[PDB]
Amino acid sequence: SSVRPYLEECTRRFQEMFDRHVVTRPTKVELTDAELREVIDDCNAAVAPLGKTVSDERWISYVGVVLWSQSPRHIKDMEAFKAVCVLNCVTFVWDDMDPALHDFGLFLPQLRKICEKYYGPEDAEVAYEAARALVTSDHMFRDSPIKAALCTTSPEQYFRFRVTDIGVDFWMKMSYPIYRHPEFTEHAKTSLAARMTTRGLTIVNDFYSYDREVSLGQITNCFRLCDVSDETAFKEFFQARLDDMIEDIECIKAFDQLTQDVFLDLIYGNFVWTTSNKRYKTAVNDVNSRIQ
């Protein structure tokens, strides 16, 4: 199945929601040519031991989420920003890989190397533990009955799994040094930051990555909880997901001004990147194909 017949209307509805509840639009970070090459060279070095090449185009597709979904008004540490570019991208490769290619002995040291290059010692350990936890989770839940149970039971069980699985807990734990903002740092470290933003990131990603995922047998997508071929059921389900995003956004507005800017730029930036990037244009292309 596919959600293509709903693409135009659902995009309009997401956009209407953002226009009313978030208003401020995300802004894209411009890296210099030098900066982008440093990021790509670090990405290539980290995945090369796994034996698969990743094209410059595929790296630029992956990196766009970081470019669009941070909070430029508040950025203090551009070395931390580059780290998030690299770490996001290389864990994206692992997400797209056949688990036969997962080699922890070769990859975990590369993740440590990245963290120690860009962060102070304490932040490096926090970022590295979160990266290690994410790639371990992605690996251990391929073909797991736990994943089946959490993804097929209810939206609540599913989003609970996604706090880690989508990578948002990792994101917050590698991004707080960008801002050096004490309250944001605490919400990152308790994972309240990831929990506040999981549904807004996941409902958007799930809608636009559905066609790819169902074609690959991937079950981690909330729209598989409804019959997408039943337009009535799909619309009621979609509305319930919009309601979840709105409630989260309204509660995010209770956080301090800087933290809420970061959280909302993340959710909205992810929507802008997702709806423009080649990764989500088609189910199988040269930036999203399974790495085998």
- Residue type at 166 in one-letter notation: I
Binding flag, residue 78, a second copy (CB under 8 A) = no
CA pair distance 34, 30, nearest whole angstrom: 11
* Neighbour-count burial of 52, counting CB atoms closer than 10 A to its CB (0-12 exposed, 13-18 middle, 19+ buried): middle
Which spans of this chain sit near Cl ion (rule: CB under 5 A)?
218, 220
Q: CA 54, CA 38: separation in Å to the nearest integer? A: 15
Q: Tell me how far apart the alpha carbons of residues 131 and 169 are, in angstroms, rounded to a whole number.
A: 9
Which of a second copy, Cl ion, Mg ion, none binds 88 (CB below 5-8 Å, type-dependent)? none
Q: Hey, what are 165's tokens?
A: 């699985």
Q: Which does 154 bind (CB under 5 to 8 A by kind): Cl ion, a second copy, Mg ion, none?
A: a second copy
> How far apart are alpha carbons 9 and 180 in whole angstroms?
39
**Total residues in contact with a second copy, by rule CB under 8 A:** 35
Choose the stretch contacting a second copy; rule: CB under 8 A; options: 34-42, 144-152, 202-210, 270-278: 144-152
Single residue of 133, 219, 246, 283 touching a second copy by CB under 8 A: 133
Print the binding letters for residues 79-98 with Mg ion: x by CB under 5 A, - otherwise.
----------------x---
Would you say 48 or 140 has its CB closer to a second copy? 140
Letters for 249-268 (x = contact with a second copy by CB under 8 A, - = none) are -xx--xx-------------
Is residue 209 a known part of a binding site? yes
Q: Say which residue the tokens 């034996």 belong to.
A: 51
Whichever of 28 and 189 has its CB closer to a second copy, that residue is: 189
Do the beta carbons of residue 70 and residue 265 sit within 8 Å? yes
> With CB cut-offs between 5 and 8 Å by kind, which of a second copy, Mg ion, Cl ion, none does residue 186 bind?
a second copy
Which of residues 78 and 251 has its CB atom nearest to a second copy in the complex?
A: 251
Closest CA to 202 of 153, 241, 253, 152: 241
Map tokens 């796994």 to a residue.
Answer: 50
Residue 136 binding target from Cl ion, Mg ion, a second copy, none, CB below 5 to 8 Å by type: a second copy
Q: Please choose, from the candidates 66, 68, 65, 63, the residue with its C-alpha nearest in 3D space to the C-alpha of residue 28.
A: 68
Near Mg ion by CB under 5 A: residue from 69, 209, 274, 288: 209
Least distance (Å) from a second copy to the CB of residue 237? Answer: 16
Q: Report helix, strand or coil for 97.
A: strand
> Please, which residues bridge with residue 291 across strands?
97
Closest CB 165 distance from a second copy, rounded Å: 9
> Binding site, residues?
95, 205, 209, 213
* Sites of contact with Mg ion (CB under 5 A): 95, 205, 209
